[PDB]
Structures are given as C-alpha cells and as structure tokens.
Amino acid sequence: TDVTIKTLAAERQTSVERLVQQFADAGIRKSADDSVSAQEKQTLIDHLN
C-alpha cells in the first residue's frame, strides 16, 4: 500500500502521482520523489468536494 512517490507516481501516472500532491495537503505523503500512498488517488474527489 505504502510506497515511495514518483516511482509509484509514474505507476498510475494520472492517479497516485497526483494523489500524493493533493494528499500532502489532505493528510498523506507528498509528491516529487519521496513518500506516497497508492490507491489514494481518491484525492481528486475528496480534495475537490
């Protein structure tokens, strides 16, 4: 579940990478190569609404 952002970010490409950024704001690890959360892509929805 927990992986390092960027490698993971690339993985989804249009999900986890994005997820990490917003989430950092949310309450998860941030993007730009470092720490990320997979399947956290929900960031788009949660953060938005």
SS (H, E, C) 1-49: CEECCCHHHHHHCCCHHHHHHHHHHHCCCCCCCCCEECCHHHHHHHHHC
Which experimental approach was used here?
NMR
Q: Where in the chain are the domains?
A: 1-49
- Please list, in sequence order, all residues whose beta carbon lies within 8 angstroms of the beta carbon of residue 34, skipping any fewer than 6 positions away: 4, 5, 6
Looking at domain 1-49, its CATH architecture is: 2-Layer Sandwich (3.30)
Residue 26: phi and psi, rounded to 5, are -55, -75
